[PDB]
C-alpha cells in the first residue's frame, strides 16, 4: 500500500487454460494458445483493465 493509495497485489498462479488446436498439419503445425482474463460481476462502466507497461512489454 503506497502512501497515496496506489495498491499492488500479486499472486502466484498455475493456470491450466484451453488451447483450441486445428491438427490438420500434424506434426508440422503452429498454434496460438490464448489466455483471456477479465472481470466477473463488474462491467465495463465500473472496472476497466489495462496493461501497466507498453503492451508489448507487459507479458
Amino acid at each position, epitope marked *: 500500500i503506497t502512501e*497515496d493509495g*496506489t495498491l499492488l497485489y500479486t499472486m502466484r498462479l498455475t493456470v491450466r487454460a484451453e488451447c483450441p488446436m486445428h491438427l490438420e498439419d500434424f506434426p508440422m503445425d503452429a498454434h496460438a494458445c490464448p489466455l483471456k482474463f477479465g472481470s466477473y460481476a463488474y462491467t465495463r462502466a465500473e472496472v*476497466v483493465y*489495462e*496493461w501497466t507497461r*507498453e*503492451p*508489448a512489454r507487459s507479458v
Partner: antibody
Amino acid sequence: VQLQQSGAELVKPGASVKLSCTASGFNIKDTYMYWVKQRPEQGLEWIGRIDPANGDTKYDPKFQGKATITTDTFSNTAYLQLSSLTSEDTAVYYCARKGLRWAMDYWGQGTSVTVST
Amino acid sequence: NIVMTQSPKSMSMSVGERVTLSCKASEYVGTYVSWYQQKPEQSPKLLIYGASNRYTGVPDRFTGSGSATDFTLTIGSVQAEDLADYHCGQSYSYPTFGAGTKLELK
C-alpha cells in the same frame, strides 16, 4: 485535464533548453508523460516517455543522450532538456499524457523553439 | 521499430460525401491504434482511442475499423470544420505515428 507548457525559446545552436509542462487537474504519478516533436508541415515524432512514480524514462534510439526527461512531483511538472542541439531541431514540442487505451488523450500547446543567430 | 504507412498522402474531397483513410502497420498492433485530428496552429486532439472507440465529445460521423495490421477511419457526412490532418499512431509498442493526411476541399 489541462497541460500548460512553456513559451517559445530563441536559443543559439550548441546550448541546452529546458522546456516545462505543468499538469493541472490530476497527479502525474497516475499516468505516463510522453514528449512529442513535430517539424513544420511534417509528421509527429516520439521523443521519450517518463514514469513519474519511479523515474523510468525511455527514449527513441535517435534521441538517446541528446534529450533527457526529468520530473518534479511536488509541483507536478515534466521537464525536457535538450543536451546538445544543432540548427535542425527547430520544431514544435508537445507534452501529452496517456489516455485510456494507451492513447494520448490530453496534449499540451507546443513550445515552438527557434535555433538561429 | 514499428512503422505506420498512412494512406493517402493528401486527398481532396467535397462536402457531404463518405471518405475513408487507411493506416497499415508493419508489425502487429492488436487494437492499440489511435487516430488524432490536428488542425493547423493547434494541438492534436484524440479522436479514436483504440480501434473503433470514439473519444468523449466526438460526433458519431467518425467510425474506426480495426485488425492486426490494417486500420481504417471512415468519416460519413463530412462537415466544413473537418479540414485538418489525421494522424494514426500505434501504442502496442513505443508509440510511432504516421505521416498524416492533409485533408482538402475541392
